[model samples]
Target chain A: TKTKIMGILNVTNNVETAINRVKAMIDEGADIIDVGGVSTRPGHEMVTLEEELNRVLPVVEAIVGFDVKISVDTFRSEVAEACLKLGVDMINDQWAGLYDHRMFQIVAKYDAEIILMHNGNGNRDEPVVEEMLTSLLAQAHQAKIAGIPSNKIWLDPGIGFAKTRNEEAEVMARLDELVATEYPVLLATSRKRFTKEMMGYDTTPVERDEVTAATTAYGIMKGVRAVRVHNVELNAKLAKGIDFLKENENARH
Target chain B: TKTKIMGILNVTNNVETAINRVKAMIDEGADIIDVGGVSTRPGHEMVTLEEELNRVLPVVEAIVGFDVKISVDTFRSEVAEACLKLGVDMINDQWAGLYDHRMFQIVAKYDAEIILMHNGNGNRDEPVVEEMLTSLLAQAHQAKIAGIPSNKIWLDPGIGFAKTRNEEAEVMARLDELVATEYPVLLATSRKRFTKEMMGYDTTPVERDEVTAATTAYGIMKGVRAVRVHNVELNAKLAKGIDFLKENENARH
Candidate 1:
């Protein structure tokens, strides 16, 4: 069963609302607050390194003493290094250290966990699951060479990033193989396009949280160690109940 | 694995809201809408058949064409018969047909499915799990004799009704035996006290649904065919995703 909850905290110009939301998530038992200065939704415009730092650092400083780990969601090494200096616990790199050569070194310097996500190329010839394994494993190897310990290197199949509907299903179908790599797997399919399509609903952000939570429970059973979700309370409660049930079921025989 | 979604429809003086809620649930992929007039929560005051009829009939009549099976949640024979006449496809008897002897006969008359929920405090020296099986099996046999076919008979372990916390955990852990009985099993532990206890959170009903959804997915893994949940959309999507993943996992072997 999965054991961690990484809460999504997007800090744009909306800093007060973000802090309150993160505080609420903490109250609801989030294990980690993943602060993102840039939205990684497909086709999103890239913000400059200065813009990213300006948006993220203040929020990190405000939340530094909170009871949970803070993960900086940035593909830039400069941003990762800055957040790390401010006591952020992890780096969620969407580019999987492919975009920035210094990402692995930055994570290693901070002695923090690094989530290497499989991304890029929506029009891949091979099946999405195959591509995911090939790419994520390659990134894991790259991280290892940069002095990040194998255990601290995590893999995310990247559900909503650059994958077709069939591709998302294919990746979800074979998440256990990702887990078989012996590194903790983080499933970040929280209220994303794949979930909305599966639900077949035009739902609000809040409305989609429930479905996201279902994924959390399902992902835990598939051997995911943590989930990055917008609704930490829902995921936290659902994860706890799932953890209890899985343990009880395992003990029965 | 669970294959259907049961949407909870609460109808009283709140008929319009109930109808809209049912519509939303159907749109969100509910396979069955369980229409309940009387609350089954512990210490709920029992209402007369006339009162239940007034509360349930109009709402059931309204949503008969919503492209989903309608289940009347009542223990009374008259209420069951009326709803069945209005094209309700199933009867969900909270009292396990023990509240009214004619319930099984009425259910059989409509050639509809009947869910016999485990309820009442028939304390035995035997453990709660054994006692539940014995009691539920007896009622199920009684229904079978009343012209209800074995296939149309479903059993709910009654997670929150008349069981202690440990007993509920025992039932949840031993659900395989319930499924082994060959009758379709509907795990109705959604947003009930058992879920709250499992969550270990001091929470409102809305807060409890997340925990309830965890039970829904976990129950699916345990081979439940359907779940009775308050938040239809949440369970429906979660169950669908889990079902997909579980089927995929099984295929790999």
Candidate 2:
């Protein structure tokens, strides 16, 4: 399967800016646009459910009809429900439905796809890859049990969340184990601290896009089905080329 | 081994422009700057020996003191000798010393490195990769016989020259065979027709940078030692990140 390029849009900016950014991302070859209202960083000002709705809805309403799949990056069941009602195609739950028990049920009810990222449990006694696979596979089964089809359930190895730098490196190195779960794997390590560490020096966010695209090509080689990123054009074009190389190589078999 | 990034400079532009471009490429992360006098494309206007010297000397003189290796992209022994006498570090002969028998000797005389690119013999009865390996290995042997050390010789598969699209695909798919030769393989498929065909659509040269970066990533995976590219920043950063991922992966073993 071809790798999908998911472009990110944080609507912490204004609605018009979000819409314009979405249009540009679509033109730049994004297969999916992930719009997030509340920042998932530690110690951020948490918004009420109403505030999250107020932040996410207008932008989703403006760009939902565009020729691209829309995925709202919310762990809140209410936000997921609101966007699904507005014809959003997917939910990118960073909490893997742990923050809200209704997350899987809401996605299943809408007949939409959901990306359950590996988060929390960094204090595990098991190996990082083992812990991540165990946690993500369980979350995926929960989604399937809630009536979501297996193909509609996606797993993300949360590169920036919960894991230490060493654990993240271990998880990245052993992505094949996660891919072996038969669930579609989504890699979301774009411009994160892990990528910054990959540079072995300080780099601005924009400077990290090339390394991010490196991860895209690397992830595709390791059987990742999609990648979420801030810069869509670089990753999209790079992924397209990698897909071509892969298909050509596979053809020899 | 770390993958080296070689940036291209056509001295067809003025000397000032070539110096400025080399400066930018070095700043962008070029390990070596390859300066060419004549265009290597088929049916291009060929430069005379004097004209070649006129085009290459000024640019090489300006940037030879820069903190990078300077490789003159020429098949003529005279040009190689001229640049080498002025402290050039390498010779990237497109003809791989087939055009001028003195190329390897000149390179050896300066104790400089040589990149013997596979070219000509397009209408071969044998398989593309087989013919390429035979041709490049023989040329590399000639370089060795001419007193160039084995480590100083780099083989390029000549992706844009002397190969059909299907043949190009075969060579790309089987790059590992080329890598198995144990010479430092330099992949030079940046913005060529092969990359254009990879897009499965029409694309300007600049639009091919991402795909070129993809080749850098793929080639690194295939054990390439270096890449000659026009977009140094993209490929350099991407290759750096890929080198990181690969080292991290290899560390687990």
Candidate 3:
């Protein structure tokens, strides 16, 4: 199967701007757009559940008619329910339903997919990858228990959150372990602290796109099923090329 | 070592445009610029030796003093000698001294690097990769016998020349074998027929940059030492990120 490209759409702005961006992203080869109403960046101010609904609902309503699949990036069950009612396809829960256990049930009830991102573990007793696998698999079990099919569950190592540089490096080096869980893995290291560190120097977010694309290629080679990225066209075309290479290599064997 | 980025500067264009492109390439993280006087595309019209020298030498003279290293892409010994006289750092011979036997000696005399590319073997008795290895290693041995040190010699698999699509695919699949030979490997599939094929449909040359960068990342993981590409910035930044990943992965072990 081809590596899926998920474009990020931070809906901090108006509906028109997002609609235009989505059109461009679709033109640029985005298969899915991950929409978020609030900033997930560290130190981001919290938004009320009502404000999150207000911010995400209109954008979801406007663009749900587009050809691309829409995934709402929210951990709150109320926000997830509101957008799922509007026909969004997936819930990218940064907290993996730990914040609100109803997330899995909502997604399961709606018959949509769920991305279980491993987050909020600043310190751990075991190795980061081991801890990540234990936590994510436990959450995945919970999602399955909630009647979400196993195939509909996705695991994300959550590159930007909760891990030190060494921990993140360990996670990246061991992504195959996450993939070996047989649940589809979504790598979301796009333009994040990990990508900035990959530069080995200070760089702005946009400067990290190349390295982000590098992660996209690396993740695909390591068996990641999809990548959530800020640069869709770059990753889309790159993933296409890699898929061809992998397919050709397999076909030859 | 980090993957080296060698930018292409086709000298068919004017001196000012060539100079501007070189500067931008350098700014975009090019470590070396490869200047060529003729197109090596299939059915390309042959240029006179004097014409090739005239086309390449002036641009070499203009950019020779730049901070980055300059490599002239020529198979003729006369062109290589002229550019080496102007203090060029390397010779990217498409023929690997087959077209003109003096190329290796001239490059050795100038105390510069030489790239031995596998080409002109469309019909071979053995496997394509096997034929490529035998021919390139033979040429490399001759270059070394001519007083060029082993480290200063590079091997390019020659993706777009003298082979069918299946041959190119075999070469790409077995790149690690090429790298295992211990000569630095330079993969040059930039916007060529192979890259277009990687697109899986018809696309303009410029649209192939992403796949070209994919090869950059793929080649790097296969232990390729460098990449020759038209899109310098894309490959440079991508190669940097892969280098970091490789380094980090190694450091973990």
Taking the candidates in order, what DockQ does each have? Answer: 0.50, 0.82, 0.71
Chain A TM-score vs. truth, each candidate: 0.94, 0.97, 0.97
Winning model by lDDT:
3
Clashing pairs in 3: none
Off by over 4 Å in 2: none
lDDT of 2 by residue, A70-113 (tens): 99999999999999999999999989998998999999999999
Return whichever of 2 and 3 wins on lDDT: 3
For each candidate, C-alpha RMSD in Å? 3.9, 1.9, 2.0
For model 1, the stretches where C-alpha displacement exceeds 4 angstroms are: A11-21, A38-42, A46-51, A122-127, A142-147, A201-207, A251-253, B1-3, B7-68, B74-87, B95-102, B120-122, B240-253
Model 1 Cα lDDT, one tens digit per residue, A99-175: 89899988998899999888886877777778888888888998898899998999998888888776777777777
lDDT of 1 by residue, B62-158 (tens): 8887788998889899999988898989999999988899999888888999998988764678888888889899999999898999989999998
Better of 1 and 3 by DockQ: 3
Candidate 3 runs further than 4 Å off: A39-42, B13-17
Candidate 3 per-residue lDDT over residues A30-131, each given as its tens digit: 999999977555678789888898889999999999999999999899999988888999999989999999898899999999999988848789889889
Candidates sorted by lDDT, descending order? 3, 2, 1
Single out the weakest 10-residue window by summed lDDT for candidate 1 chain B.
Answer: B244-253
TM-score of chain A of 2: 0.97
What order do you get sorting by DockQ, best first?
Answer: 2, 3, 1
